Amino acid sequence: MTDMNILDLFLKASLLVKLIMLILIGFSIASWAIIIQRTRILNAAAREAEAFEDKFWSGIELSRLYQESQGKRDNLTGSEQIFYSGFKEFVRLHRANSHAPEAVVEGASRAMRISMNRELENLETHIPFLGTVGSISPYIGLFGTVWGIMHAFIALGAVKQATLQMVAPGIAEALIATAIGLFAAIPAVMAYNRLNQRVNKLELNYDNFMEEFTAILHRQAFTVSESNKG
Amino acid sequence: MTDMNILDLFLKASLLVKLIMLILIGFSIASWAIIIQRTRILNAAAREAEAFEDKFWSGIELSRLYQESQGKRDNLTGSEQIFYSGFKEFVRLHRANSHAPEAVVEGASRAMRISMNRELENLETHIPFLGTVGSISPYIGLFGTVWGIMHAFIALGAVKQATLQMVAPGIAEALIATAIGLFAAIPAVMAYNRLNQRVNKLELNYDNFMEEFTAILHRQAFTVSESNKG
Amino acid sequence: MTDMNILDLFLKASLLVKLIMLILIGFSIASWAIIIQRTRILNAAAREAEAFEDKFWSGIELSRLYQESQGKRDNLTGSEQIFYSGFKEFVRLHRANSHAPEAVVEGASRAMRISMNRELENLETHIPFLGTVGSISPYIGLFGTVWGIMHAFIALGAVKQATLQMVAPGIAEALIATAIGLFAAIPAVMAYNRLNQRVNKLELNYDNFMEEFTAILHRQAFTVSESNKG
Amino acid sequence: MTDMNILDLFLKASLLVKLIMLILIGFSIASWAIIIQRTRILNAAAREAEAFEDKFWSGIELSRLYQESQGKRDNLTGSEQIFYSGFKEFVRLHRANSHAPEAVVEGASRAMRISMNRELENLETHIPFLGTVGSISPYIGLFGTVWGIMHAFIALGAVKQATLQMVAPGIAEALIATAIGLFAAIPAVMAYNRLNQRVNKLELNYDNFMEEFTAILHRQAFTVSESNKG
Amino acid sequence: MTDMNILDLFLKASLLVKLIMLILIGFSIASWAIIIQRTRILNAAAREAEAFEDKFWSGIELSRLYQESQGKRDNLTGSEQIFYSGFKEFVRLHRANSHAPEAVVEGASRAMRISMNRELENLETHIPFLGTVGSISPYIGLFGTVWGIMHAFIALGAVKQATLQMVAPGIAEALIATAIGLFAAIPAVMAYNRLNQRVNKLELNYDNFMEEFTAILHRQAFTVSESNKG
Amino acid sequence: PLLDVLLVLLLIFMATA
Amino acid sequence: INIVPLLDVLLVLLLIFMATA
């Protein structure tokens, strides 16, 4: 019995076939890599945002907190960056329009929304690649199968005596193409849904915190406004 | 008549394919057990939430109900857990910082959010795995089927006189893989949608409770604070 | 010439294949039944809700309207049912906490949310079955089709000599199976989307009503409180 | 020689197959009709909205424009109808309950949104019909193709030895349903999506008109009410 | 030996078949050129938008950056175009409508939104082409492939001793159209996704900058108007 | 897809014997 | 409706179907 390992069919495969196969292989490799690195990123972000909110809710001085965060402004992440941006813009706005706590509050809110959306993009990098990959790869398995059966027909039509042997390589090509497509797809679908869920969770967290800090800052601006007139 | 029955084919299954089959069977059993355990948890939680809702809406005194919850505080769950967390936080902050009713209210809302999300982690647990199964399983079955079928099919084309026997048993077996995969997927997906539905129901119930309790706590803070100043 | 009857194919079907075809038949039938019943109920509810919304926004007196509804209360639904319950809660909170128009209004709105969620459930009934069936059936059909195919190759490998004639019945049956699954699936899915859309429409309308009644109740409570004092 | 006319199959198609072709072609005609009619309607709606915006933002006072609109109030669509309804309701609410300009704004805004909802309903009429037909027709064709499939199989079942002579009529007969289904499907989805896009454009435009006009009405109400108390 | 190469059978495609193949080739060329041009356009627009935002958020004077944008007004896109138009409309309405800084800035912001809509429409141009072409060209190729193969098997139907070589050539000549269509569709879908993602990135760019500039312009108008009444 | 292999089944059915 | 896993099989079917000769 021939040691009919898949490597043999690949090596005997036609040029376009091998190109397609390697395209799929690269997609799969990059897919796993993206999933891994992004997952680590999101875990770190989740832990740090959680801890940051926990400490912030502890009732510590807001100004002291901003001092400490400014201590490493070079390395703010998620909740910390949002707090720094909101509080700094609050400082400036109150110095300008303490008379309009609503206006100052809305300005700080815009600032925090900007910081948040920037952070969210920073997090979401390459997820859409996963979405596209899970969208396309089976179509690739298809077209590969199609080219395989095409060469199969070319071979079968050129022999005086019809024999199923001539099409065997073509359909073997189809099979290998489709297998690689499936293999690339599985992680795509799995991790894509997982990651979208996690990032939406974080987005909820940040939005909630944003609203909370918003009310807190509206209150604080009003308090400082009333105190200044004492 | 060869006893070419499915069990034995599985017994003599090829290396990689049999490995895949065992993987899928484990997926199936794990889906089964996850469904069972989580179903138990969710049923009991629905029951306990039901009773707690009914007892709370009864107009019963808040302090009395809190004391009764406290008596088993070590084993609180669901709306009971949320109520304990929020109410204890409220009392502590009221006794420390009664002067800022808004602040105490906000802290209480924070606490109820915290406990509630903890509860949702406890409940939702492992469901995303059910989703992951109902998502991947078909493709795994495809993949194993394809690999083995390729082996047999191309084993055919290496003999001068293509003969059906060298393949048909092999492919008959290989298809068993996709069969099993889909067999696991079906109950998986059914249970997935069911459980997620129930979970959303729970979520809405809890959120409505959180809001009503929030209103009550706001009212109590304001009423007591203004009464003590009369 | 003999009429080409699927019956000869049926009675040759294996245990499992016939049973699965029956599953599909039943699921399809119940799909149709649910589609019809739910569709009629939803349409009529929407029309009655429109009529009641226009009647309320007709400038009709709130108390007059409530007496009129209370006359036939045993048959309230949707907008009018929520109006009845919410008006009841507004009445009782105003009687107990006229001194707190805002708090009274909040308890009013909560009674409204209670009734609304009740109606959303009452109306949604069985729809998730629609989504489940639509989303699950194709896999069922593929499973049966694969099973038939497996038994076909069982018939084929157990014969030394190959031929097309021995296998056609199994192929025909299995393909019929896939077809049946798809037949059942498509209606379910289409209906699921459509119905959920119309349900969301109703839900939006109801929430709009709740908030509008809430604010009108705010004005009503404040006005009743103040004019009776001056 | 005999010309290889395509109808050579249609005439020999089995009665079921001709039935499937007839139903699918009827849905094709309906697709074309609703597509074309909605196309003309949306083009005209866009042009009328352009026309009304051009004069509304030309600086003309809204009282004279309102009287012009009243001249044909029987005949209002889109931005113009929103304009007239808002004008009328705003005037009546401001004259009736001037004490609450916010109430004037709210009631008028809900009236404007009502008119916009009705106009959107007008634009969307039967569009979902196009979407559903495009999604579904290939499956109606599936039914007939499947019946032809089974007819062909029973056709080959007549001869002891299978061969490539017998059922080709049955095969090309079966496929007619599929082809007619795709014929029904292509334009239906094409136009469904295209008119979806155009209607999104129109809905956005009407919403923006609602926003600016609602703000204009709010400013008019507030300024008039404040001045009345000078 | 006859040179039955891919190009050979393509050229020897039957009239309908050759025409379908040519249509697919045209779609391919169009999608390729559109993709490259729009991709470089997106790169250029993103480069310009990011550079202009970096310049704006450096503290540059509104009047100075404003007339600087006036200098290349005829070659402004995206964020730079939106800012230039926004400050122009704001200034113009303010001079005409200084009495209503709010009304001025809201009119200018809506004009900015209108410019954003126009530029986004410019961006999406040729993109729906790509999406729907990728969707449908599979249909165009496959339909014809299907019919050709039907006729081929009708022809080989007359043969007493069936041999695939009487149909393998026709089957391949048919399948060529399917293969080319799908090969051209793959990149269509990939580019559609990638460029649409870029498009949404730019759209968010523009909405966020519009909101920032509108708030800043509200502040500017308020300050100038209040100083004007000193 | 559903439609696409309606043929393939019919075809390779028609051509196998 | 997920469709990917559907017919990627059937092609496979007709390969043994071919093996029948």
One-letter identity of residue A72:
K
How far apart are alpha carbons B135 and B129 in whole angstroms?
9
DSSP at E74? G
**Are B151 and B166 in contact, with CB atoms under 8 Å apart?**
no
Residue B158's φ and ψ, nearest 5 degrees, are -100, 15
CA-based nearest residue to C152, from C178, C164, C170: C170
**Are E108 and E86 in contact, with CB atoms under 8 Å apart?**
yes
**Are E192 and E62 in contact, with CB atoms under 8 Å apart?**
no
- HSE on the CB side for C101, CA within 13 Å? 14
Burial of D47: CB neighbours in 10 Å, binned 0-12, 13-18, 19+: exposed
Q: What is the DSSP string of D215-227?
A: HHHHHHHHHHHHH
How far apart are alpha carbons B178 and B146 in whole angstroms?
9
**Are A181 and A26 in contact, with CB atoms under 8 Å apart?**
no
Indicate yes or no: CB of D153 within 8 angstroms of CB of C172.
yes
Tell me how close the Cα of G14 comes to any Cα of chain C, in angstroms. Answer: 10
CA-based nearest residue to B187, from A189, C143, F13, E36: C143
Residue with tokens 């809405």: B204
Indicate yes or no: CB of B4 within 8 angstroms of CB of C157.
yes
A121 CB neighbours in chain E (<8 A) are: 201
How far apart are alpha carbons C18 and C14 in whole angstroms?
6
3-state DSSP assignment of residue A158: coil
CB-closest option in D175, D182, D193 to E150: D175
CA-based nearest residue to C133, from C180, C198, C192, C199: C192
Q: Taking a contact as any Cβ pair under 8 Å apart, which residues of chain G between 1 and 21 contact chain F? A: 3, 6-7, 10-11, 13-14, 17-18, 20-21
How far apart are alpha carbons B172 and A119 in whole angstroms?
53
Domain containing residue C95: 16-227
**Are A179 and B143 in contact, with CB atoms under 8 Å apart?**
yes
CB-closest option in F4, F14, F17 to E153: F14
- Chain B residues at the A interface, defined by Cβ less than 8 Å, are 102-103, 106-107, 110, 113, 128, 131-132, 135-136, 139-140, 142-143, 146-147, 149-151, 153-158, 162
CA-based nearest residue to C79, from C108, C42, C60, C53: C53
Indicate yes or no: CB of F15 within 8 angstroms of CB of E153.
yes
Q: Is residue E1 assigned to a domain?
A: no
CB-closest option in C113, C153, C158 to B171: C153
- Compute the count of residue pairs across chains C and F with CB atoms less than 8 Å apart: 11
Q: Is residue C7 assigned to a domain?
A: no
CA-based nearest residue to E202, from E76, E64, E45, E86: E45
How far apart are alpha carbons D123 and G4 in whole angstroms?
35
How far apart are alpha carbons B207 and A173 in whole angstroms?
55
Q: Is residue D8 assigned to a domain?
A: no
Residue B191's φ and ψ, nearest 5 degrees, are -60, -35
**Beta-carbon count within 10 A of B128 CB:** 16
Chains in contact with F, where contact means 3 or more Cβ–Cβ distances below 8 Å, are C, D, E, G
CA-based nearest residue to D122, from D78, D74, D69: D78
CA-based nearest residue to F7, from B146, D25, E137, D173: D173
B92-100 contacts, C-beta under 8 A, 24 or more apart:
B94/B221, B94/B224, B98/B221, B98/B224, B98/B225, B98/B228
One-letter identity of residue C34:
I
Burial of A162: CB neighbours in 10 Å, binned 0-12, 13-18, 19+: middle
CA-based nearest residue to C12, from C138, C151, C137: C151
**Beta-carbon count within 10 A of A198 CB:** 17
Indicate yes or no: CB of F4 within 8 angstroms of CB of E164.
no
C24-30 contacts, C-beta under 8 A, 24 or more apart:
C24/C137, C24/C140, C24/C141, C24/C177, C24/C180, C24/C181, C24/C183, C24/C184, C25/C180, C25/C184, C27/C133, C27/C137, C27/C184, C27/C188, C28/C180, C28/C183, C28/C184, C28/C187, C28/C188, C30/C129, C30/C133
- Per the structure, the count of domains in chain C is 1
Q: Is F2 touching C (CB cutoff 8 A)?
A: yes
Q: Is residue E203 assigned to a domain?
A: yes
How far apart are alpha carbons C142 and G9 in whole angstroms?
9
Q: Is residue B104 assigned to a domain?
A: yes
Tell me how close the Cα of A46 comes to any Cα of chain G, in angstroms. Answer: 32
How far apart are alpha carbons E77 and D65 in whole angstroms?
36
How far apart are alpha carbons B190 and B35 in whole angstroms?
10
Indicate yes or no: CB of F12 within 8 angstroms of CB of G3.
no
Indicate yes or no: CB of D153 within 8 angstroms of CB of C163.
no
Non-local CB neighbours of B194 within 8 Å, separated by 6+ positions: C128, C132
How far apart are alpha carbons A218 and C83 in whole angstroms?
35
Residue with tokens 């209606």: C187
Distances (CA, A) of D171 to D2, D145, E154: 20, 9, 9
Distances (CA, A) of A206 to A70, A90, A124: 20, 18, 15
Burial of D2: CB neighbours in 10 Å, binned 0-12, 13-18, 19+: exposed
How far apart are alpha carbons B80 and B61 in whole angstroms?
15
B55-60 contacts, C-beta under 8 A, 24 or more apart:
B56/B83, B56/B209
How far apart are alpha carbons A113 and B207 in whole angstroms?
25
CA-based nearest residue to E137, from E78, E202, E196, E183: E183
Q: Which helix (H) or strand (E) holds A204?
A: helix A168-228
Q: Is residue C10 assigned to a domain?
A: no
Tell me how close the Cα of B195 comes to any Cα of chain G, in angstroms. Answer: 20
Q: What is the DSSP string of C103-124?
A: HHHHHHHHHHHHHHHHHHHHHH
What string of H, E and C letters represents the secondary structure of D33-83? HHHHHHHHHHHHHHHHHHHHHHHHCCCCCHHHHHHHHHCCHHHCCHHHHHH
CB-closest option in F4, F12, F17 to G14: F12
Q: Is residue D113 assigned to a domain?
A: yes
Indicate yes or no: CB of D143 within 8 angstroms of CB of C183.
yes
Non-local CB neighbours of E97 within 8 Å, separated by 6+ positions: E103, E104, E107
Non-local CB neighbours of A27 within 8 Å, separated by 6+ positions: A133, A137, A184
**Are F12 and G18 in contact, with CB atoms under 8 Å apart?**
yes
Question: What's the count of helices (H) and strands (E) in chain E, helices before strands?
Answer: 7, 0
How far apart are alpha carbons D171 and D167 in whole angstroms?
6
Q: What is the dihedral of CA A82, A88, A94, A100, to 10 degrees?
A: -30
Q: Is residue C67 assigned to a domain?
A: yes
DSSP at C162? -
Burial of E9: CB neighbours in 10 Å, binned 0-12, 13-18, 19+: buried
**Are C133 and C192 in contact, with CB atoms under 8 Å apart?**
no
Do E and F count as touching (3 or more CB pairs closer than 8 A)? yes
CB-closest option in A138, A171, A185 to G15: A171
The b/e string for A205-218 (b: 16+ C-beta within 10 A; e otherwise) is: bbeebbebbbebbb
CA C230 to chain centre: 51
Tell me how close the Cα of D61 comes to any Cα of chain C, in angstroms. Answer: 30
The two tokens of residue F7 are 């043929």
- Nearest residue of chain F to residue G10 (CA atoms): F5
How far apart are alpha carbons D208 and B20 in whole angstroms?
57
- HSE on the CB side for C17, CA within 13 Å? 26
Reduced to 3 DSSP states, what percent helix, strand and coil does chain E have, rounded to the nearest 5?
85, 0, 15
Do E and B count as touching (3 or more CB pairs closer than 8 A)? no
CA-based nearest residue to A149, from B139, G11, B174: G11
The two tokens of residue D63 are 């009282």
End-to-end CA distance of chain D: 100
How far apart are alpha carbons C174 and B178 in whole angstroms?
15
Measured on CA atoms in the order A30, A32, A36, A39, is the torsion positive or negative?
Answer: positive
**Are B140 and B110 in contact, with CB atoms under 8 Å apart?**
no
- Chain A residues at the E interface, defined by Cβ less than 8 Å, are 103, 106-107, 110, 113-114, 117, 121, 128, 131-132, 135-136, 139-140, 142-143, 146-147, 149-150, 153-154, 156-159, 162
How far apart are alpha carbons D72 and D66 in whole angstroms?
10
DSSP at A160? S
Q: Is F6 touching D (CB cutoff 8 A)?
A: yes
How far apart are alpha carbons E84 and E70 in whole angstroms?
7
How far apart are alpha carbons E178 and E144 in whole angstroms?
8
DSSP at B160? S
Ramachandran category for residue C60: left, alpha or beta (phi over 0 → left; psi -120 to 50 → alpha): beta
